[PDB]
């Protein structure tokens, strides 16, 4: 086994900021990790390259992945528009946890969030499937452009993304 490493190169108003890399827990959350991996490479025909982080709430999390509507309403998985919660074995234990954003039970699509804090209230409601491997400083930097209701000061995009390992 070797878990995928995927990266996002973040751009703020078109100007590249830095890279955040993630290890995806494919050995424990295989279907959720494969969905994020294939959307990072774009091998199915659509994906994250170019999408923005539409919702950033400082001290909580940074959310993105809505590559169809760019506002929290769209996105689709490689499986169909929505797929089921695979399991809840992993918890939201601290900053850097990568988890599925959803609109209730069994509504996984392509949106995801990166916790910048331990968020125990999300356990059992959002499937954790990865963690930041390097670039946590870039995540902290992204936070400064968010607001209490999640709106961003600047246009935060995924300039490029793909799979390293």
């Amino acid at each position: 086994m070797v878990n995928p490493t995927v990266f996002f190169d973040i751009a703020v108003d078109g100007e590249p900021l830095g890279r955040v890399s993630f290890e995806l827990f494919a050995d424990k959350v295989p279907k959720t990790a494969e969905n994020f991996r294939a959307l990072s490479t774009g091998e199915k025909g659509f994906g994250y390259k170019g999408s923005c982080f539409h919702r950033i709430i400082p001290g909580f999390m940074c959310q993105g992945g809505d590559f169809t509507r760019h506002n929290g309403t769209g996105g689709k998985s490689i499986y169909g528009e929505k797929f089921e919660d695979e399991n809840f074995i992993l918890k939201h234990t601290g900053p850097g946890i990568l988890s599925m954003a959803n609109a209730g039970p069994n509504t996984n699509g392509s949106q995801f969030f990166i916790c910048t804090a331990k968020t125990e209230w999300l356990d059992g409601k959002h499937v954790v499937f990865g963690k930041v491997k390097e670039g946590m400083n870039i995540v902290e930097a992204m936070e400064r452009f968010g607001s209490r209701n999640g709106k961003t000061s600047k246009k935060i995009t995924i300039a490029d993304c793909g799979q390293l390992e």
């Binding site: 919702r55 709430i57 929290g72 959803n102 609109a103 949106q111 969030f113 999300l122 999640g150």
Partner: peptide
């Protein structure tokens, strides 16, 4: 209608 985790502020 908009997806995503519920914020601390939405809870209190």
């Amino acid at each position: 209608v908009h997806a995503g985790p519920i914020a601390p502020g939405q809870l209190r």
